[PDB]
């Protein structure tokens with residue numbers, strides 16, 4: 404029974420995974436031009452996934468304009484939701500590349516297909532800026548630890564991401580943050596990392612963005628590759644694999660590479676697999 | 688593209704609401720007899736709603752057997768998920784009454800239809816047992832308040848529900864619990880209430896059941912009617928309306944009535960409206 408003038412089709416994509424029930428889900432809503440943004444926000448709250456996206460007609464030469472909502476706020480750019488959106492739209496085109504307009508500009512995607520299905524995509528992210536957070540004691544207390552292995556810096560590529568280093572994967576898994584205390588950190592996500600060489604583990608916490616713990620924070624993957632190189636953990640330009648979401652039962656694998664030098668970054672690439680979990684229609 | 692031997696259809700019901708985007712969503716999965724329970728749990732985690740339910744063939748004379756999963760655990764009975772399941776199954780029968788088998792026994796529902804759609808249902812809940820929680824100082828500290836207006840008691844009807852009284856609706860809305868501290872309260876939900884006469888407000892918090900704050904805790908509505916009468920706030924048998932979820936943007940209206948006396952309860956009725964938000968199919 405419709406409860407509006409338009410129904411909307413949607414697909415659920417598990418981003419940063421090659422099998423369903425892993426990765427980070429995103430609900431992608433098609434033909435969304437009739438929806439007021441306040442209604443988009445309410446739909447995102449209804450789905451209760453880390454993000455829902457809304458596919459709109461392009462306005463600046465791209466293939467589509469995408470608006471991105473967490474359960475509580477709109478974001479101007481986000482990695483897992485746009486990866487899932489690109490994979491979902493990939494089912495309706497033969498094109499190798501897709502150009503998704505966002506509030507941070509047009510994001511270029513390269514799609515990978517196997518046996519007629521889009522199985523993965525790679526994006527060029529906005530090049531982030533960064534500075535010291537300057538709230539170290541407060542943040543470490545909220546996380547329940549005494550120190551970060553590296554300087555605590557906050558990066559901006561639309562959302563904001565703070566990085567806190569842990570000395571081992573066991574120490575990362577042992578974190579039990581005070582999420583009420585973390586709620587004093589507005590308009591940012593807290594990304595905690597540990598690992599070595601090519602392979603890193605992450606956990607992300609963001610009351611500001613409406614989620615206790617997120618499974619795959621794609622817009623943090625590019626900045627982490629920069630952060631690791633700036634602090635001598637990898638060489639600049641080394642590709643990394645970032646496994647997030649293990650503790651919450653949503654293992655997600657993000658691939659990232661940042662080209663250049665800290666003061667002259669030229670590209671920040673993030674890629675991953677994705678798979679369709681479901682499809683449906685909503686009544687408004 | 689299927690990722691299993693069976694796909695499953697589902698519907699999303701907004702329980703305890705008469706308009707979509709209000710109430711508490713539940714995902715109801717049909718034809719679920721092929722799914723192992725570990726897979727049901729993973730699907731519930733994927734949907735990330737307070738509950739997903741799975742419709743199985745009946746084994747004890749009912750219409751269906753329903754298994755109920757939060758994002759983190761199975762429950763033996765729950766009110767909003769069974770209300771939504773009854774409404775969803777109501778679309779596929781003409782019957783006025785539906786009998787849903789659960790781990791707590793067979794739950795009887797009366798369906799209300801208007802213009803060919805099921806718009807509401809009423810259930811007879813298990814009669815709860817109760818005792819003093821005996822953890823008052825710990826719980827009040829976690830909630831961030833100094834006292835409860837009434838004795839803090841824990842009720843069992845499958846899940847467990849603790850009730851903490853607040854002196855005003857403003858005081859209820861002002862709560863900002865320490866959810867990490869609440870995680871020391873296992874196998875229970877914390878229900879905080881305020882109001883007067885026929886009309887009450889509630890908020891529910893349950894890290895044990897995988898949710899920071901739930902919008903409509905239907906298995907707490909029956910016990911609250913008992914609790915209010917035992918503590919002199921209403922007469923035994925007075926119907927109450929319980930509005931939950933306002934602060935999180937998911938206003939949900941639960942109707943409850945408990946018949947008898949505290950020591951000889953004969954019926955605990957909970958009812959509400961529900962509406963279909965969406966329908967779809969998953970790949971496994």
Ligand SMILES: CCOc1cccc(C(=O)O)c1N
Pocket residue numbers: 453454473474478480481482483484562592609612613614617619620621622623
């Ligand atoms: C709402 C919590 O989750 C997130 C917040 C910010 C960014 C992303 C992303 O994928 O870049 C994200 N999944």
Ligand SMILES: CCOc1cccc(C(=O)O)c1N
Pocket residue numbers: 737738757758762764765766767768846876893896897898901903904905906907
């Ligand atoms: C998982 C958090 O939510 C809940 C917990 C326990 C019971 C119910 C219910 O509706 O009776 C519920 N919605």
